[PDB]
Amino acid sequence: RLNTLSPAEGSKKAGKRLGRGIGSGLGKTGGRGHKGQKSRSGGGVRRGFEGGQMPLYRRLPKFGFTSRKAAITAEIRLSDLAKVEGGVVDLNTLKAANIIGIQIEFAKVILAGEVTTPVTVRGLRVTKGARAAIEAAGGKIEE
């Protein structure tokens, strides 16, 4: 029987229709109020416009720059470190396992999660905690 399936309770609701009678609760002016710019079609002030007063994003100064090198430097999580699927942990091996990003030239091993495989790491910088974890798990780092 096809005419037997029904949606889960609370999964669907009608919503609201403005300007349909008094009983609906949104008649006449539908959630608009009386007069003013907030009413009317296409009304309302632009984004971040707090009146004619100088806005927050303009009364505060600028600072900093973009390194152009942080965008080419990833960090690998010590948790998995297994998607390499055998062999050593290399930059190209990480790229092959979709864990780093093709347009990446520097990676950090970091201490996050846990590792148990004794696989080694080559040509990657390792934090002190990550190094300790790898050596405890029986790995090796290409000093």
Partner: protein
């Protein structure tokens, strides 16, 4: 279409770990001779955005 961020606010605010925003204090650009060293030292660090301004900051920065 995509929402276009306010580039003026993108270089004014930066997002923090718990969703807050950090910004640089004002009154530290010029005419600094008559300002107290205590005042300038307290202004030198960076502060967080207040409760009332978070709505405007988030509206300006949708992709931050």
């Amino acid at each position: 279409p995509k929402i276009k961020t306010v580039r003026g606010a993108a270089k004014r605010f930066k997002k923090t770990g718990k969703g807050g925003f950090k910004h640089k204090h004002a009154n530290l650009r010029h005419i600094l001779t008559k300002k107290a060293t205590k005042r300038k030292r307290h202004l030198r660090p960076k502060a967080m955005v207040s409760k009332g301004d978070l709505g405007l900051v988030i509206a300006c920065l949708p992709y931050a």
